[PDB]
C-alpha cells in the first residue's frame, strides 16, 4: 500500500482480532491484552460501503432492442448488427475490468491509509513519553496501568501527567 | 504532584489490524492476484432457469410464432386481441395454414412485437363483384377448409374479377396497421381460373405512400399440399390519411386494422418455462437477479438487467490486504 | 550563541486551511455528496434558443424541404444553385406540386444534404419523337400549370411514343448526380392516352450499374387533384462513365446534373430562429456554447460540440473539502 | 483524505483565512496573527487547474452523422439506428460519471496531501525546538518574536540559533 | 560496555534516488508533460509494409475479385475450389467476361468471403427442351467464345423455350449456396431471338423462400461488345429443403452448389505484397506487431491486433520523476 | 507526488546513482560512500512491471467485421456503417488517453511513496541517535564507521549499542 503500514512496518495481521479491523494489543502492569479500535474500523468500513453502493447504483433498463441471434445467413445488415453488439460487449467488458482494478487498488491503499492514520494519531497523543519501536509498537516510558492504556485508546491520555516520569526514565543514559 | 520514585517501569502498546485465515484473491492496477480479507462478486452468472411472470406481462406463444398469431392461423386463434410486455416464442412453434412468405419478415415481427397489442378491429370493406371468403384445404378450420382469420381471399364471382378500388379513411386519432397480401398462382391456368386476368396487380396506397406488387406465377415446393404462395405486406395509415386498396387480381384483402401502441414491449425467443415469481430481468435462460452490476448469463435481456460482460467473475475487494500469521 | 536566560517563554504556531460558509456538494469514488470549497459544472444544459449564423453557412429552408428544393417545386425555386453547411428544414414546410414518392427518400435527403450544393447544370438531351415539357395543374407555375423545374415530363406525339435511347457521357473530372423519375398512371386509359403503349419501361444505366422500373397503374388518393404518382430515382455517373436513358413510356426525364461535393455539410430539422452570432455548435434547440466537455441539450448536433450525456449536472470539484468553523 | 490532515488532525478550517488556501495562525509574547502560505496555495491551485484544462481539452467536431429522430415506423434498420445511438449515449454517460468521480476523489486527496506536506515541512524546519501538539499546532519552546515567526513561514528559520534555549526549556522536568 | 569517551563525532547519511540526464516527457491527470526517467510506447504506428503469409492462409486474388473468382470468369479459373483465411483483393483486378451486375453485391462478397471456401460440386440438372451451354464473345475461353465456368446460359431449343421446372433436394447435412442469374436482353428482338417468349420470368424457391425476377429489356452501355447485362442472385438451401428453379425465359442456370463453411475467414482490399513471415495481425498496410495495446496504422485489421486509436503516440511512464542535479 | 519526497524534501536526484533507483550516500570516520538500496528498487520495479503486464494483457482478435472504406455514395446504410466505426474509434481513443493518464499519475506517486517509505524506514531504525536534517539526510550523533553505515543500510543497526553516546552528544546544549 502507499503508506507502508499494512504489510509494511506492521509485519502481519492478527487473526485473533475478531472484534474490529484495527486495534491495540498491549502488555503492562496488570499484564497483556487486546482491544479493537472501533473508530478507524468504522472509517474503513463506511468508505468501502460507499464504494460498494455507488457500483451497485442504478441498473439501466432496456426493452425492445436489436436481434442478437440469427438463423440464416444474410450479409451486410446482419454483419452490422453483429458488429454493433460485439463492439458494445467489448467496451463494457473493458469498463468492468478497469473499474474493479482501480477500485481494488484504492481499497488496498485506503485501508493502509487508515492503519497509518491510527498509528500517527496514537504517536501524536503520547507526545514525549513514548518511543516508536518501529514495528508498529510504542514503548511507553512510564508506569501505565490498564486505565492509562484505556485513556490512550479512548483518546483522553494527558501526556503532561506523566511527562517528567517518562522524560527522566527515557534520557537516563547508561550502559 | 507525586514524588520521585526509585523504581522505573515502562509499558508496550502495539497497533495492528485483523487478518483472516482464508482470504480471497482479487485483481488490482499492479497485481493480478493479491489476497484481501473479503470481496464481493460483481458478475451475475446463473439463472433460475425460469421466466418469472412478474412484474412484466409475459405471453407464452406456445406453438404460435407472433406473425402466425397476427395473421390468424387457425391453431393460433387463442391469441386474438392479446396483449403483452414480452411475447415469448418457443422453438417448437409451427405454422399450419396456407404457405406464405413475408418480404421483410423481420421488420414485421418487430413492429407488432413493440406495439404490444394484437387488438383487431373489423372494418366494413365492400368487395363488389368478387367472391369473398375463400379458404383452402391447407388451412383447416376444424373439419373444413379455411384461411387466416384476418385476411380475406377474394376470387372471381361468376366469370369475372373487376378492378377493385376501395377506400377506408383513418378518421380516428391513432395509427392503424393494415396487414394484406397477394397470391402467387402456381400455374398460368390457376391464375385465370381464380382471378380471370392473366396478370393481377395490387396497389395499396395512402397520401403518404404507395406499393404495387404483381404476383409471380410458378411452381414452388409442395407445402401443405400447395405449390402456390401468398406474400404478406403491411401499411400503417396515419390519422387523417386514407387507405386505397386497388386490384384487378390476386388480392388477399384486409378485414380491418390492428391498433398500434408505443411502449416497453418486445419479443424473446426462449424455451425456458414461465413460472410464478417476481423478477425484473428476463434473459432467454430464465430470469436472473439484478442486484449485481454485470452479468454473464446472456446478452439478450428484457427489463431492469445487469450489463452483459465477457468476464464470468469480477471480484470487488471489500476488505484490507490479508497478511496472516498462518494458524488454521 | 547567548548565555542562559532567567525568563522562559514559548510561542504557538498552528497550520490550517480556509473554509467557506457555502460549500458545493460533489460526488466521489466513496461518497455521493461530499461538500467541497468550490466546483465547476461540466454539463452544458441550456441553449440560446437560436441558431447562430456564424461560422457555418446556415441555409433556412423556410417552407421547402431539401428534396422539394432539389426537384424544383415552384414555390421552392428560390433555392436554385444554393449552397450550405447546414440546411435547416422547418416543420411547416410543405410540398405543392405534382404528387411524388421517393423510394429510399432517406438516402436521397442524405446524399444531397452532405453534398452541400444544389448547383445544377443543364445538359442538351434531345428527346426525338415525344412532346417535351409537359406540366400539370397540380404544380402551378404562377397562373399556369407547370412542373418541377428540373424534371421533363415527356408525352407522346400524336399517335406514337418511340423507344427513347439517349446517352450523356461524363467527360468532366467530377461525379454527376442525375435525378429522374417514372409516372404511374391512375388508369389504363391514362397510360395509353399519355404514352400510347400499355406498359412503359424506364431503364437508366451506366457501365457500372443499371435500374429498370416499370410503372404501376392504379388509383391512389387524390392529392392536388391527382391520383397518379411519379416516383423519383437518382443515378450518380462517375467521371469517364456514360449514362444511357432508355424508355418506351412513362419517363420523367432529367434536364441535366447536380454537381456532387464532399464536405462538412448536413441537414437538421429545427424550428429555432436563425440569428446573427458566432457559435460553433448547432443543436435543433438553438446553438449552445462548447466550453464545457459534456451537454445535455440535445443528442443531435452539428459542429464543434460537447458530448451528449444523460446526466444534466456533473460537478468537478475545484477545491479542498469544506470543513467550516461554525460546525453542525 | 488519504493523509488525514484536512478533516483529520486539523480539526476544521478557517473561514477567516481569505487570502490563501493554507496558512499559519500563532501566539507569541508580541501577540497573535495569521498569514496565508502562498507557496502551497499555488501548488494546490496549479494541480487543480492542470486537471481542469485537460478535461476542457479539445472538443471533437462531428458533421453529417445519422438520423436520431424518426416519424414513421420502419422496423429493422431504424431499430439499429436507435440501438447504435442509445448505446453510444450510455457509454459516454458512464464515462462522464466515472471521470468526475475519480477526478473528485483525487482533488480531495491532493489538497489533503498539500496540507500535510506544509505541516511536515514546518515540522522538519523547527527541528528540536518545538513539539507537535497534535492538533496541527506546534509549541515553539523558545522566545519567538514576530520576525522569528516570519522566518519560519518564509523558510529561513535557523534552529541552531535557538536550540540550547529551546532544548533546556523543553526538558526541564518538573511538576 | 566500554567507558565514556573524551572524543565525540557524528556521521551523515543521506537518502536519494537516481535521475538520468535524458528524461522522457509523459502525460498525467494534472500535467500534460512531466519528465520521467523512462517510458514505453503503447501505440504501434508502423507496418512492415508486407502481409506475412503465416499463420493465416492468405490467398492473393491477383487480378481477380472474389465474385469473379466465384462466378468463374475465364481469367480467374485458377481459384477453382480454393480456400482462404484472408482473401486479399488487389486494386488492379479486372473482370473480363460477360457484363453482369449483382444486386446486393456487397452481401454476396461478404457471405462467400466469410465462408472461406470456393469448393464447388456439380449437380446433374437436366434442362429439357433448351440449348445448354451458351457462351459469348465477351468471355473468351481461350480462342473461343465462353462464359462463367459455373453458370449455364440456356437458350431455346428448336423454336421453343418450354417452361423449365426442376428440383434439387438438399439431402446432405450442410447448407448449399446456389449462384444463378437472369439475362436482360438489349432489344425486344434479342428477347424473342434467344428465348422465344416476349417476357421471360425466373422464380427460384425453397420451402422457406421464393424470389421471382423478370428481365428488363433495354440498351445499356457497350461493355465488351455487349449492351445486355446478366444479374447474379444467390439462394442458400438448408439441409432437407429443396430448390425448385422455374422459368420460361432468360434463366442463366446454376451448375451445382458451393459449400458453405462458418469460420474465421474474411476478405481485405490491399496492395501490400505477401511475404514469408509470421505475424498474427494483418492490416491493409502490411502486417504489424501486436505486442503493443493500441495501434494507429489502420482501422481495418484481421487477426490478433492492437486496438485502433487516433493517438499516434501514448507513452506509459515506467519510471519515477526525473529531477536531475546538473540537467543540461 | 503525494508524499513530497521526490522533487520535494529530497531536492534532486543523483545522476551518479547508476546501480539502483533509491540509495544512500554517507560520510563518516572512514570517508564518504554511496550504495544503492536494492530492496526498494525492486519494490518500485515490480509494481511498474505489474502495471505494464496488465496493460500488455490479452489482445482481442477479430476476423470478419464490417467494411470501413467505401468507393461509392450509398446513403442511409453506409452512413450508419461509418457512424458505428467512427464512434467506436472515439470511445477507444478516449479510453487509451484516460488509461495512460491515470497510469502515469499513479507511477509518479508510487515511486514517490517508495522514496518516502525508505526514508521513514531508516528514520525508525536510527531511533534516538539521529536527527532529521530535513533535506533527506540524517545527522547520526555518534561514531559511525563503515560497518555501522553498513548495518543501517542492511537493516541490522542496533540503536541501543550507541544510544548513550548519541544521546549525550545530542543534548549537550552549548553555544
Ligand atoms: C415442378 O417440379 C416439381 C418437382 O418435380 C413438382 O413438384 C411436385 O409435385 C407433386 C404433385 O404434382 C408433389 O406430390 C405430392 O407429394 C406428397 C409428398 O408426401 C404426396 O403426399 C402427395 O400425395 C403427392 O405425391 C411433390 O411433392 C412436388 N415436389 C416438390 C419438390 O415440391 C411440381 O409439380 C412441378 N410443377 C409443374 C407445374 O409441373
Ligand atoms: C377509387 O376510389 C377512390 C375513393 O372512392 C376514388 O377517389 C376519389 O375520387 C374523386 C374524384 O373521382 C375525388 O373527388 C374530389 O374530392 C375532393 C374532396 O376534398 C375535392 O377536392 C375535389 O374537388 C373532388 O370532388 C376524391 O377526393 C377521391 N377520394 C379519395 C379518397 O382520394 C377514385 O376516383 C377511384 N378511382 C376510380 C378510377 O374509380
Ligand atoms: C442506344 O444508344 C447508345 C448510344 O448512342 C447506343 O450505343 C452505342 O452502340 C454502338 C453500336 O451500335 C457502339 O459502337 C461500338 O463502339 C465501340 C467503342 O470502342 C467500338 O469498339 C465498337 O466497334 C462499336 O463501334 C457504341 O459504343 C455504343 N455507345 C455506348 C455509349 O455504349 C446503342 O446502340 C443504342 N441502342 C439502340 C438499340 O439503338
Ligand atoms: C379460394 C380458392 O380458390 N380456394 C381453393 C384452393 C385454391 O384454388 C388453391 O390454393 C390455389 O393455390 O384450392 C383448393 O383445392 C385447396 O386449397 O385445397 C380448394 C380451395 O377451396
Ligand atoms: C403532360 C400531361 O399530360 N399533363 C396533363 C395532366 C396529366 O394528364 C395527368 O396529370 C395524368 O395524371 O393532366 C391535367 O389534367 C392536369 O394535371 O391538370 C392536364 C395536364 O396538362
Ligand atoms: C447464347 C448466345 O446467344 N450467345 C450469343 C450472344 C448473345 O446472343 C448476346 O450476348 C445477347 O446479348 O451473342 C454473340 O454475338 C456474342 O456474344 O458475341 C454470340 C453468342 O454465341
Ligand atoms: C478513558 O479512560 C479513562 C481511564 O481509564 C476513563 O476514566 C474514561 O472514562 C475513558 N474515557 C472515555 C471517553 O471513554
Ligand atoms: C464481505 O463484503 C460484503 C460486502 O461488503 C459483506 O456483505 C460481507 O459480509 C463481507 N464479509 C465479511 C466476513 O465481513
Ligand atoms: C377485439 O376487440 C374489438 C374492440 O373492442 C372487438 O370489437 C372485437 O370483437 C374483439 N375480437 C375478439 C376476437 O376478441
Ligand atoms: C444461457 O443460454 C445460452 C444459449 O441460450 C448459453 O450459450 C449460455 O451458456 C447460457 N448461460 C447460462 C449462465 O445459463
Ligand atoms: C471555482 O473554480 C473555478 C474553476 O477553477 C473558478 O473559475 C472559480 O473562480 C472558483 N471559485 C472561487 C471562489 O475560487
Ligand atoms: C446554376 O449554375 C450554372 C453553372 O455556372 C449556370 O449555368 C446556371 O445557369 C445556374 N442557374 C441558376 C438558376 O442560377
Ligand atoms: C431540446 O429540444 C428537445 C426536442 O427538440 C427537448 O426534448 C429537450 O428537452 C430540449 N432541451 C433543452 C435544454 O432545451
Ligand atoms: C524571513 O524573515 C526574516 C526575519 O523576519 C526576514 O529578515 C527575512 O527577510 C525573511 N526572509 C524571506 C526570504 O522573506
Ligand atoms: C524503460 O521501460 C521499459 C519497460 O519497463 C524497459 O524495457 C526499458 O529497459 C526501460 N529503460 C531503462 C533504461 O531502464
Ligand atoms: C472441386 O471439388 C469437388 C469435390 O471433391 C470435385 O468433385 C471437383 O471436381 C473439384 N473441381 C475442381 C476444378 O477442383
Ligand atoms: C496505412 O494506409 C492508409 C491507407 O491505406 C493510410 O492512410 C495510413 O496513413 C497508413 N498508415 C501507416 C502507418 O502506414
Ligand atoms: C550488516 O552490517 C554488519 C556490520 O558491517 C555486517 O557484519 C552484517 O553482515 C551485515 N548484515 C547483513 C544482513 O548484511
- Set of chain A residues whose Cβ sits within 8 Å of the Cβ of B308: 89, 92
Is residue F59 within 8 Å of E325, Cβ to Cβ? no
Q: How many CA atoms lie within 13 A of E68 on its CB side?
A: 21
Q: Which three cell numbers stand for residue C213?
A: 422500373
Are A63 and B302 in contact, with CB atoms under 8 Å apart? yes
B153 within ligand 4 shell (Cβ under 6 A): yes
Alpha-carbon distance B81 to B78, whole Å? Answer: 9
> In the numeric block, which cell numbers belong to residue B123?
372494418
Distance (Å, rounded) from C-alpha E229 to C-alpha F119? 85
Query: How many other CB atoms are found less than 10 A from the CB of residue E263?
Result: 12
3-state class of C23 per DSSP? coil
Q: Cell numbers 487547474 label which residue?
A: D49
Residue nearest to atom 8 of ligand 16 (CA): E121
Specify whether the CB–CB gap between A24 and B14 falls below 8 A. yes
| Strand, coil or helix: A128 | helix
Q: Whole-angstrom Cα distance, residue E118 to residue E259?
A: 7
Query: What is chain E's alpha carbon radius of gyration, rounded to the nearest angstrom?
Result: 33
Q: Grid coordinates standing for E14?
A: 543521506
Using a CB-CB cut-off of 8 Å, the residues of chain A touching E107 are 74-76
**Helix or strand (DSSP H, E) at A92:** helix A76-126
- Cell 435481456 locates to B301
Look up residue A79 and give its three cell numbers.
Answer: 454483419
Question: How crowded is residue C6: how many other Cβ atoms within 10 Å of its Cβ?
Answer: 4
Farthest-apart Cα atoms in chain F, separation: 93
In angstroms and rounded to an integer, the radius of gyration of the C-alpha atoms of chain F is 27
Ligand nearest to the CA of E256: 16
3-state secondary structure chain B: CCCCCCCCCCEEEEEEEECCCCCEEECCCCCCCEEECCEEECEECCCCCCEEEECCCEEECCCCCHHHHHHCCHHHHHHCCCECCEEEECCCCCCCCCCEECCCHHHHHHHHHHHCECCEEECCCCCCCEEEEECEEEEEECCEEECCCCEEEEEEECCECCCEEEEEECCCCCCEEEEEEEEECCCHHHHHHHHCCCCCEEEEECCCCEEEECCCCCCCCCECCECCEEEEEEEEECCCCEEEEEEEECEEEECEEEECCCCCCEEEECCCCEEEEECCEECCCCCECCCCCEECCCCCCEEECCEECCCCCCEEECCCECCCCCCC
Bridge partners, E214 (sequence order): none
3-state secondary structure chain E: CCCCCCCCCCEEEEEEEECCCCCEEECCCCCCCEEECCEEECEECCCCCCEEEECCCEEECCCCCHHHHHHCCHHHHHHCCCECCEEEECCCCCCCCCCEECCCHHHHHHHHHHHCECCEEECCCCCCCEEEEECEEEEEECCEEECCCCEEEEEEECCECCCEEEEEECCCCCCEEEEEEEEECCCHHHHHHHHCCCCCEEEEECCCCEEEECCCCCCCCCECCECCEEEEEEEEECCCCEEEEEEEECEEEECEEEECCCCCCEEEECCCCEEEEECCEECCCCCECCCCCEECCCCCCEEECCEECCCCCCEEECCCECCCCCCC
Distance CA B103, CA E176 (A): 22
D25, containing H or E segment: strand D22-28
Q: Which ligand is nearest to the CA of C150?
A: 12
All cell numbers assigned to C77: 425555386
Q: Which ligand is nearest to the CA of E78?
A: 16
Does D72 contact B at CB distance below 8 Å? yes
**D138's grid cell:** 506546534
Q: Which of B115, B66, B120, B86 is CA-nearest to residue B261?
A: B115
Residue nearest to atom 17 of ligand 6 (CA): E136
Q: Give exposure, E32-58, as e/b (b: 16+ Cβ within 10 Å).
A: eebbbbbbbebbbbebbebbbbeebeb
Is B112 exposed, middle or buried (CB count within 10 Å of its CB: 0-12, 13-18, 19+)?
buried
| Torsion (CA) C301, C307, C309, C313 in degrees, nearest 10 | -110
Q: Phi, psi at residue D23, to the nearest 5°?
A: -175, -175
From B276's Cα to the closest Cα of chain E, the distance in A is: 37
What single DSSP character describes residue F133?
Answer: -
Chain F residue nearest residue B27, CA to CA: F54
Q: Are strands B315-317 and B39-41 parallel, antiparallel or unpaired?
A: antiparallel
Cα(A165) to centroid(ligand 9), Å: 98
Partners of C144 in beta bridges: C141
Cα E121 to averaged position of ligand 16 atoms, centre (Å): 6
- Pairs of residues, one from chain D and one from chain E, whose beta carbons lie less than 8 Å apart: 14
Closest residue CA from atom 18 of ligand 3? E222
- Other Cβ atoms less than 10 A from the Cβ of B77: the count is 13
List the one residue out of E46, B137, C29, B193 whose CA is nearest residue A51.
C29
Q: Which residues of B touch C99 (CB under 8 A)?
A: 207
- Give the CA distances from residue B47 to residues A66, B283, E115, in Å, rounded to whole numbers and listed in that order: 22, 8, 34
Identify the residue whose cell numbers are 422539394: C68
Tell me the torsion sign for CA atoms C20, C22, C28, C33: positive
Beta bridge partners of C259: C176
User: How many of the other CB atoms lie within 10 Å of CB of C5?
Assistant: 12
F33 Cβ under 8 Å from any chain E Cβ:
no
B55 prior amide bond cis, ω within 30: yes
Query: Shortest Cα distance from A137 to chain D (angstroms)?
Result: 19
- The grid coordinates listed for D62 are 462531428
C-alpha pair distances (Å), B33 with each of A3, A6, B30, C251, E239: 20, 17, 9, 74, 49
Q: What residues flank ligand 3, with Cβ below 6 Å?
A: C 165, 167, 242, 244; E 187, 219, 221-222
Method used to obtain the model: X-ray
- The SS3 of residue F163 is helix
CA of B224 to the centre of ligand 9 (A): 30
Q: What is the dihedral of CA D102, D105, D110, D111, to 10 degrees?
A: 140
- Cell numbers for F87, please give them: 464512434
What's the sign of the alpha-carbon dihedral D118, D124, D126, D132? Answer: positive
Q: Which helix (H) or strand (E) holds C88?
A: strand C86-89
Cβ E199 vs Cβ E272: under 8 Å: no
Inter-residue contact C255 to C150 (CB < 8 Å): yes
Q: Which helix (H) or strand (E) holds D103?
A: helix D76-126
Q: φ and ψ at A8, to 5 degrees? A: -135, -120
Instruction: Let me know how long chain D is.
Output: 175
What is the C-alpha separation between D160 and D14, in angstroms, rounded? 32
Element (H or E) spanning C257, and its range? strand C256-259
- From CA E44, how far away is CA E293, in angstroms rounded? 8
CA angle (B194, B197, B203) in 5-degree steps: 95
Asked if residues C200 and C249 have their Cβ atoms less than 8 Å apart, the reply is yes
Rounded to whole angstroms, how far apart are CA atoms F150 and F170?
Answer: 22
- Check A173 against F164: CB less than 8 A apart: yes
Task: Check if the beta carbon of residue B265 is closer than 8 Å to that of residue B113.
Answer: yes
Q: How far is CA D83 from CA A64, B260, B282, D90, in A?
A: 9, 21, 19, 11
Q: Which of E98, E130, E136 to mutate to test the pocket of ligand 6 (most atoms within 8 A of CB)?
A: E136
Residue from the list C101, C217, C221 with its beta carbon closest to the beta carbon of B244: C221
Strand ordering across the sheet containing C242-249 = C164-169, C242-249, C201-205, C210-213
Whether the Cβ atoms of residue E281 and residue E304 lie closer than 8 Å to each other: yes
B245 Cβ partners below 8 Å, 6+ apart?
Answer: B125, B164, B165, B166, B168, B180, B202, B204, B251, B253, B254
DSSP reduced 3-state for C12: strand
Query: By the 8 A CB rule, do F128 and F157 touch?
Result: no
E strand or H helix at C25, and its extent?
A: strand C24-26
Cell of E294: 493500441
Torsion of CA D152, D153, D156, D158, to 10 degrees: 0
Q: How far is the CA of E135 from the centre of ligand 6 (A)?
A: 7
Query: Which backbone phi and psi does D142 adopt, to 5 degrees?
Result: -160, 165
Half-sphere exposure of B238 (CA within 13 A, CB side): 10
Specify the CATH architecture of the domain F1-175.
Alpha-Beta Complex (3.90)
Tell me the residues of chain D between 134 and 173 that have a Cβ less than 8 Å away from chain C: 135-144, 148-149, 152, 161, 165, 168-169
A105 and B29 Cβ atoms separated by less than 8 Å:
yes
Neighbours of E22 (CB within 10 A): 11
**Dist. CA A153–CA B14, nearest whole Å:** 11
Domain covering E57-272 assigned CATH 3.90.209.20 in the classification: yes
Could you say which DSSP state residue D132 is in? E
Residue in chain A closest to D128 (alpha carbons) equals A128
For ligand 10, the distance from its centroid to the CA atom of residue B297, given in whole angstroms, is: 6
Cis previous bond, E55, omega within 30: yes
For residue C35, how far is its CA from the centre of ligand 11 (angstroms)? 15
Tally: H helices and E strands in chain C: 3, 29
The three cell numbers locating residue B148 = 387466416
CA–CA–CA angle E204, E205, E208 (5° rounding): 155
Q: What is the C-alpha to C-alpha distance for residues C151 and C208, in angstroms, rounded to an integer? A: 24
Sequence ranges of the domains in chain A: 1-175
The residue assigned the cell 397540380 is C138
Quick check: bond before C55 cis, omega within 30?
A: yes
Amino acid at each position: 500500500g502507499l503508506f507502508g503500514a499494512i504489510a509494511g512496518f506492521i509485519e502481519n495481521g492478527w487473526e485473533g482480532m475478531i472484534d474490529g479491523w484495527y486495534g491495540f494489543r498491549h502488555q503492562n502492569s496488570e499484564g497483556t491484552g487486546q482491544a479493537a479500535d472501533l473508530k478507524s474500523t468504522q472509517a474503513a468500513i463506511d468508505q468501502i460501503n460507499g464504494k460498494l453502493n455507488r457500483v451497485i447504483e442504478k441498473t439501466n433498463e432496456k426493452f425492445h432492442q436489436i436481434e442478437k441471434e440469427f438463423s440464416e445467413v444474410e450479409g451486410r445488415i446482419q454483419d452490422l448488427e453483429k458488429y454493433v453488439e460485439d463492439t458494445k460487449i467489448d467496451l463494457w467488458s473493458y469498463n468492468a475490468e478497469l473499474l474493479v482494478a482501480l477500485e481494488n487498488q484504492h481499497t488496498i491503499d485506503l485501508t493502509d491509509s487508515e492503519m497509518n492514520k491510527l498509528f500517527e494519531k496514537t504517536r501524536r497523543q503520547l507526545r514525549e513519553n513514548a518511543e516508536e519501536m518501529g514495528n508498529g509498537c510504542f514503548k511507553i516510558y512510564h508506569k501505565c496501568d490498564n486505565a492509562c492504556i484505556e485513556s490512550i485508546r479512548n483518546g483522553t491520555y494527558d501526556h503532561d501527567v506523566y511527562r517528567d516520569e517518562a522524560l527522566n526514565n527515557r534520557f537516563q543514559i547508561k550502559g | 504532584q507525586d514524588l520521585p520514585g526509585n523504581d522505573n517501569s515502562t509499558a508496550t502498546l502495539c497497533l495492528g489490524h485483523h487478518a483472516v485465515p482464508n482470504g480471497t484473491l482479487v485483481k488490482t492496477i499492479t497485481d493480478d492476484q493479491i489476497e484481501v480479507t473479503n470481496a464481493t462478486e460483481l458478475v451475475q452468472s446463473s439463472s433460475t432457469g425460469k421466466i418469472c411472470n412478474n412484474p412484466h406481462r409475459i405471453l407464452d406463444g406456445i406453438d404460435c410464432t407472433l406473425i402466425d398469431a397476427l395473421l390468424g392461423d387457425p391453431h393460433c386463434d387463442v391469441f386474438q386481441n392479446e396483449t403483452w410486455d414480452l411475447f415469448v416464442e418457443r422453438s417448437k412453434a409451427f405454422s399450419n395454414c396456407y404457405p406464405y412468405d413475408v418480404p421483410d419478415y423481420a421488420s414485421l415481427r418487430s413492429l407488432v412485437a413493440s406495439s404490444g397489442t394484437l387488438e383487431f378491429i373489423t372494418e366494413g370493406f365492400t368487395w363488389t363483384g368478387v367472391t369473398q371468403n375463400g379458404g383452402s384445404n391447407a388451412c383447416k378450420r376444424g373439419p373444413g377448409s379455411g384461411f387466416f382469420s384476418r385476411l380475406n381471399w377474394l376470387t372471381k364471382s361468376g366469370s369475372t374479377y373487376p378492378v377493385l378500388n376501395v377506400t377506408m379513411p383513418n378518421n380516428d386519432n391513432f395509427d392503424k396497421l393494415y396487414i394484406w397480401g397477394i397470391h402467387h398462382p402456381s400455374t398460368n391456368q390457376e391464375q385465370t381460373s381464380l382471378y380471370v386476368q392473366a396478370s393481377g396487380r395490387v396497389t395499396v396506397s395512402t397520401r403518404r405512400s404507395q406499393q404495387t406488387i404483381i404476383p409471380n406465377i410458378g411452381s414452388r415446393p409442395w407445402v401443405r399440399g400447395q405449390s402456390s404462395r401468398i406474400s404478406i405486406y403491411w401499411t400503417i395509415v396515419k390519422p387523417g390519411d386514407v387507405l386505397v386498396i386497388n386490384s384487378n387480381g390476386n388480392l388477399i384483402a384486409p378485414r380491418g386494422y390492428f391498433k398500434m401502441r408505443t411502449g416497453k414491449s418486445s419479443i424473446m425467443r426462449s424455451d425456458a418455462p414461465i413460472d410464478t415469481c417476481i423478477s425484473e430481468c428476463i434473459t432467454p435462460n430464465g430470469s436472473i437477479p439484478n442486484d449485481k452490476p454485470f452479468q454473464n448469463v446472456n446478452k439478450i435481456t428484457y427489463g431492469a438487467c445487469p450489463k452483459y460482460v465477457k468476464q464470468n467473475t469480477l471480484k470487488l475487494a471489500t476488505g484490507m490486504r490479508n497478511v496472516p500469521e498462518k494458524q488454521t
